Design a protein around this nucleic acid. Sequence first.
DNA 1: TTTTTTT
Lengths: 558, 140
Amino acid sequence: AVFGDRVRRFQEFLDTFTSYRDSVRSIQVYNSNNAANYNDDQDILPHRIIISLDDLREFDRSFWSGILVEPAYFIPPAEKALTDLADSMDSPRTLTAQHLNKLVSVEGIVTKTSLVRPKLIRSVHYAAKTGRFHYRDYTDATTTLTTRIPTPIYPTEDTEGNKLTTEYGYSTFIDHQRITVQEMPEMAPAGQLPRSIDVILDDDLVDKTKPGDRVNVVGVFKSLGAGGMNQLIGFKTLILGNTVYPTDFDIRNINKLSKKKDIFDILSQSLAPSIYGHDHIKKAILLMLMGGVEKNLENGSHLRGDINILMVGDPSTAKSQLLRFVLNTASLAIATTGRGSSGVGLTAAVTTGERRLEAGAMVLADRGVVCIDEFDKMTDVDRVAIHEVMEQQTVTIAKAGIHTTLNARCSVIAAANPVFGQYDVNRDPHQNIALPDSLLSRFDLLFVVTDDINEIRDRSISEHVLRTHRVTIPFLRKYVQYAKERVIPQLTQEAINVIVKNYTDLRNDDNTKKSPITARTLETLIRLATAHAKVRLSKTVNKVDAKVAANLLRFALL
Amino acid sequence: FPPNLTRRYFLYFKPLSQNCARRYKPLSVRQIKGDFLGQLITVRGIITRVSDVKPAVEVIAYTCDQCGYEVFQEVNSRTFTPLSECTSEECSQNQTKGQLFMSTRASKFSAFQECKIQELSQQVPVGHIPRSLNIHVNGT
DNA sequence: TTTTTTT
Ligand SMILES: Nc1ncnc2c1ncn2[C@@H]1O[C@H](COP(=O)(O)OP(=O)(O)OP(O)(O)=S)[C@@H](O)[C@H]1O
């Protein structure tokens, strides 16, 4: 009697506010029109509703308190009232012991996604002689949210001797999945390994988190299992009842700001919030974040479009301090420092008896940024795999389990020291690094940074760092992903005449100073005008972008 | 004898083409929701790690050896259980029951083989790992 | 199927 009173009360409240009613109206009308277009020319949305915690507070604090205190009594009847209405219409650190048996909002990182298996709920069985169907359900502790008597064996020959032929199609199924979320590592105490728990999803939310993202989670803390009173520490935990959580004036501001001619320089100086000089270096980070164009050839292979730069310089020129700026400003990047053994270029498959995979560092940074620190200090083992990652954009893993082949087209930035000391221009331009020769042609830009001692520069470094101890960034990444979907460019005739003369300069006179001169350099000549056109959001390719690229080659090398 | 015990033939269904559906299906493994069981689907992919063909037992004959009848056990599951000494009509209501055993030439088999299908790697999302799936093959 | 050695 209690259940129907809670049902009718919440139904009255849901009937009290019609704001959600027109939402369900749009749900039903849209699914109707979607099935209407699918059944007229040729000859999706679920039923769960976001309920704000707005009106529940202005109606009954008793009922409010009941939801956030004992949710195992009010969410099922409220959904029951909703389904009736649908039919009438047609921190982990302080999480244990207390902050328990309630609805908990959890934040953290998506990691180690498990496997997808479906689960049966409603059985359909046909009897031969009676010529009738039947009905039988089964429940487990994930689905009921209430401690009910479990009813597990698949039925046959129930009452008279009629063959209970089971049927399908009409028999229902629901998928199932469990994932782990550890809290954010910067939030941790003085110095420790972060500790974690897990949350189980349901049917329409299977495979929404891949290992490696930033996710807010809202759900209910559910504890199952016989805690050692079965036959020594039990009562293992998990979380259920879940949701997934990762302007026109603003976009008009974007279109309005982009109507200028020197914002590349303005954004260039913008990306130096604490570093003096290195103007064209910031210009190159803008062009890397632009990402270039992708032109897959006719029945051939794709051509890589992003740009990768490794640095070398005197050990005091923000070599490592330029990296975290690129870390925070871009999107979906992972920083690798020092060693990278067993998991940068591979997945290793160490995981019922089966073989599973965990996406490695190079794979997880797909369509993103790879931050590599101390490239010469990397052991010689993975150096072979770096050529494959950087040139064919694929990773083939052939271990004893299953040989596979996949895609990762990541952007990579590295930072290395000279071989010994500061002799970066003293000995010879060649092999001040003692890197393999193919890696020279593999990387796009190679910066040589000196530590030239002067005085105007000395005073300017002084007041910059000194006032440091005593237009903006969020506008920029929005400007980036907006510039991604409609500013894709196309090459023009004017793009040819400059880079041809430029490649002639690369072979007739550039070889007299340094090396190498590859056709890949000419590909970068196309990519820079492309990225300049993406930053200016142009559609064509202009001669002026190539004029900029000539200075970019001179500043990067000569 | 049941008519299922004496068949010698098979029946194959037949899918509809998309041209007449246009006049009067491209699925992915990720698009294969685990809720379409019992339905009719159409997939595409790459055959990977094909196994070998081995015989599948269908029905079991049982020789009476005393009364001279033949007992039959039809199996459609993976496993089953042994039965009694005899299930003849004459061995029953008698002190000395028979003793049975199976037979090979009287049993019926069927072609059985399976393999794995890998994803197209063109329809794979940008940050996922491609899955695979098992498909059983029987008969012709 | 991966971590501390030494010729
Ligand atoms: N132009 C600059 N403006 C502001 N800070 C600067 C500048 N150049 C250097 N820094 C300083 O860069 C220091 C850190 O330098 P690092 O690059 O980490 O030294 P490092 O030894 O090269 O690092 P690694 O990773 O060991 S190579 C910080 O204290 C910054 O203040």
